[PDB]
Amino acid sequence: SVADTVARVLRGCLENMPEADCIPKEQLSTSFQWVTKWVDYSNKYGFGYQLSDHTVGVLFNNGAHMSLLPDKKTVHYYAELGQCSVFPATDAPEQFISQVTVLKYFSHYMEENLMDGGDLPSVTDIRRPRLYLLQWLKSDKALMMLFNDGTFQVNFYHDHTKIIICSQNEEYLLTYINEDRISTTFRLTTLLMSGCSSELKNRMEYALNMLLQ
Numbered sequence: 001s002v003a004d005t006v007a008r009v010l011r012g013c014l015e016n017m018p019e020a021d022c023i024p025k026e027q028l029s030t031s032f033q034w035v036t037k038w039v040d041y042s043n044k045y046g047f048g049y050q051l052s053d054h055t056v057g058v059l060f061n062n063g064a065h066m067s068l069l070p071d072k073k074t075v076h077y078y079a080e081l082g083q084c085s086v087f088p089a090t091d092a093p094e095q096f097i098s099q100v101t102v103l104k105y106f107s108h109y110m111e112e113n114l115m116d117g118g119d120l121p122s123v124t125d126i127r128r129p130r131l132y133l134l135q136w137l138k139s140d141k142a143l144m145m146l147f148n149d150g151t152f153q154v155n156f157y158h159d160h161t162k163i164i165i166c167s168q169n170e171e172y173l174l175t176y177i178n179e180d181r182i183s184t185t186f187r188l189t190t191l192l193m194s195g196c197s198s199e200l201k202n203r204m205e206y207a208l209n210m211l212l213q
Contacts, residue, residue: 003135003211013204014204018194020194020196023186031124032123033123033149034151036117037050039109045060045061052123075088118162134148142156151166154207163177172189176200
């Protein structure tokens, strides 16, 4: 249903926007939560990412999810079945220890082998009930990540281009991160009217197809 909403929106814009050469000229200055780095170790432990605020998250293979907050000290854990536990990392209870030291592993792999996926400015304050990954999908072309608040992100392998759909002031936004990791953020309402370049449009289409899976 979170997914239904994002699809409904993105199909809407895709089926209704015009033909264009260039991307839209009207562009915004803002920040919001998005995935700056990620790491797939799903063959063994699960899938990890880092967010814009420097929270580290991991979706484990068994369904559970852990986040390390930007203080590097505080953990938020959801079980498979939804149950939320919050405790500090170093004083973890027995049955979470293996997973915490894995969370930590992911944090340090990302910190010292990977670079930020984009030049969006770090969100200083993320205040809402905080994000966790609902769902991820990899095809041979791209990685798709969907968060509990509807934030939608797809990263293309070939050229490190990315698309991000989020909602900010009760409004839908799409940002394109290009080959140079420069970000441009539009109003969806704006893309609807003015359309965009075929390169962006094709990536939007590819993204939608990932969502309909």
